[PDB]
Design an enzyme around this catalytic site. Structure first.
Site, mmCIF file in Angstrom:
data_model
loop_
_atom_site.group_PDB
_atom_site.id
_atom_site.type_symbol
_atom_site.label_atom_id
_atom_site.label_comp_id
_atom_site.label_asym_id
_atom_site.label_seq_id
_atom_site.Cartn_x
_atom_site.Cartn_y
_atom_site.Cartn_z
ATOM 1 N N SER A 11 -0.497 15.559 -12.045
ATOM 2 C CA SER A 11 -0.727 15.190 -13.431
ATOM 3 C C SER A 11 -0.977 16.445 -14.255
ATOM 4 C CB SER A 11 -1.926 14.243 -13.514
ATOM 5 O OG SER A 11 -2.332 13.998 -14.846
ATOM 6 N N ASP A 69 0.842 -1.195 0.000
ATOM 7 C CA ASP A 69 0.000 0.000 0.000
ATOM 8 C C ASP A 69 0.879 1.248 0.000
ATOM 9 O OD1 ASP A 69 -1.904 1.916 0.312
ATOM 10 O OD2 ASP A 69 -2.455 1.351 2.365
#
Length: 330
Positions: free
Chosen positions: A199, A35
């Site tokens: 992004s 994770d």
């Protein structure tokens, strides 16, 4: 040193991935959910409330000659899906894919919430976010990667998750045969303890690319791709009959649909998520309403590039003095 381990989807939907991890002496192998959005290595154990164990493999520290109680240490964690677990702490030898750390904090669960009990395939979590998020008190502990880093050939790990197929976590090296083209690296903020990056935009299907900054986290422990409501609406508007369902808890679409791809920007590069990766199947057994793999982050407070996005790429988690993320197509 290096390590390399195969990671395997837990079910036919890729709801999560499990990677075998050796703990203790002699080894006890548990299948952990790696994770990158959390920083605790915790396991089902001989200390877990018996009624909360249902098929998981447990760690028994009393059978490990290298286990030592970390005296006074406790841990307690809550995840973004509302699940939680807590317990005490041992140190022990932990190996992943041939890479060994001695003295790793292994957080033994005394209590786990129902969603963990109900998932027999996940024996615990191995956190790979920054150690500043580790919950052990009163002495915060380091992640497996942080402990291994100095020994690694290169201070990196890579995630190569498969679509409906196994993939690989590598530690200490970048497998140049595992991706196409070049790896595009992008800046990371560690201020919130995550692999947080920006992004450069998105496209839906064959549509034109929209240049827009989207801050979010690379999180292998989250199944879906969670993005701003504007972006998610633009995606689902291209699917006939798709709608946001308050009763189901997100966007659903007719199971008869063919989904468009979704592209996200990494600097000037582009990662394309095929439409099929966005199909999470019937909302309930036999339903013709299917659950979408791109969902709004509006109720979260952060955008999450979860498995839906990451499995479309070869992803480098660069833990150099200034961390960065790398993405390549594959």
């Amino acid at each position: 040193s290096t390590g390399s381990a195969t990671t395997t989807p837990i079910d036919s939907l890729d709801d999560a991935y499990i990677t075998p991890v050796q703990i203790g002496t002699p080894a006890q192998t548990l299948n952990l959910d790696f994770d990158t959005g959390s920083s605790d290595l915790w396991v089902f154990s001989s200390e877990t409330t018996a009624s909360e164990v249902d098929g998981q493999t447990i760690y028994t520290p009393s059978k490990s000659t290298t286990a030592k109680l970390l005296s006074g240490a406790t841990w307690s964690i809550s995840y973004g899906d509302g699940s939680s677990s807590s317990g005490d702490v041992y140190t022990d030898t932990v190996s992943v894919g041939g890479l060994t750390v001695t003295g790793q904090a292994v957080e033994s669960a005394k209590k786990v919430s129902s969603s963990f009990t109900e998932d027999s395939t996940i024996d615990g979590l191995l956190g790979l976010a920054f150690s500043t998020l580790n919950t052990v008190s009163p002495t915060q502990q380091k992640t497996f990667f942080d402990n291994a880093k100095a020994s690694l050939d290169s201070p990196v790990f890579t995630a190569d998750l498969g679509y409906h197929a196994p993939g690989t976590y590598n530690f200490g090296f970048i497998d140049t045969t595992a991706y196409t083209g070049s790896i595009t690296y992008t800046a990371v903020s560690t201020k919130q303890g995550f692999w947080e990056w920006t992004s450069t935009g998105y496209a839906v299907g064959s549509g034109t690319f929209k240049s827009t900054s989207i801050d979010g986290i690379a999180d292998t422990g989250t199944t879906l791709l969670y993005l701003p409501a504007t972006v998610v609406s633009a995606y689902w508007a291209q699917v006939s009959g798709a709608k946001s369902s308050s009763s189901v808890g997100g966007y659903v679409f007719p199971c008869s649909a063919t989904l468009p791809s979704f592209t996200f920007g990494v600097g000037s590069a582009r990662i394309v998520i095929p439409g099929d990766y966005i199909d999470f199947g019937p909302i309930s057994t036999g339903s013709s309403s299917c659950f979408g793999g791109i969902q709004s982050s509006a109720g979260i407070g952060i955008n999450i590039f979860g498995d839906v996005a990451l499995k479309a790429a070869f992803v480098v988690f660069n833990g150099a003095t200034t961390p960065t993320l790398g993405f390549a197509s594959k």
